[PDB]
Design a binder for this molecule. Sequence first.
Ligand SMILES: *[C@@H]1O[C@H](CO)[C@@H](O)[C@H](O)[C@H]1NC(C)=O
Length: 198
Amino acid sequence: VKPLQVEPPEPVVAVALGASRQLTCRLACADRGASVQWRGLDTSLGAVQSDTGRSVLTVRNASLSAAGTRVCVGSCGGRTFQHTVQLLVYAFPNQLTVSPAALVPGDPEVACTAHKVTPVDPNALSFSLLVGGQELEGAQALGPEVQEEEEEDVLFRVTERWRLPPLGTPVPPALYCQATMRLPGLELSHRQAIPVLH
Ligand SMILES: *[C@@H]1O[C@H](CO)[C@@H](O)[C@H](O)[C@H]1NC(C)=O
């Protein structure tokens, strides 16, 4: 095993807005002046270096400013070791709004808005329009519209819209909007019912 080890070891660690995470950097060293440094936001909270074999970095009540690349550097007997890990701070939406909130057969469009979300990158944040547990075939996605929420941290409001196909017979009792967020080691989802009236 390498002299320097970080737990957790993954190159990207995701932390929710308001949550906590602890990164422990351990350096095995027989010599006396072994040093462990946590840095990466040196222009900000700053770098911290100690004569030690163990240094723990803790993010508490994570804010978006906690995000960024951290590096643990260990020095033992003139040799230097490192581990680089990106902290990703995200906010999964705490509310979806569907418009219209209920559909009548024949309605041509439905919109689903995710509130207070970040990141908005479509490679992480996705929207699906389902009937049963399957994607509704023929639903044309008009593309996410992104805006800031009103005024730490600035979060976003993201709306997907679909032109609807005929819903067919038998008419489904509901559609569902699902917002899904995919990050390293994580898949988060929010499915909201859309009643179909009449
Ligand atoms: C967490 O952070 C926010 C500031 O963004 C603060 O308003 C809230 O009270 C904090 N919670 C604690 C425990 O300090």
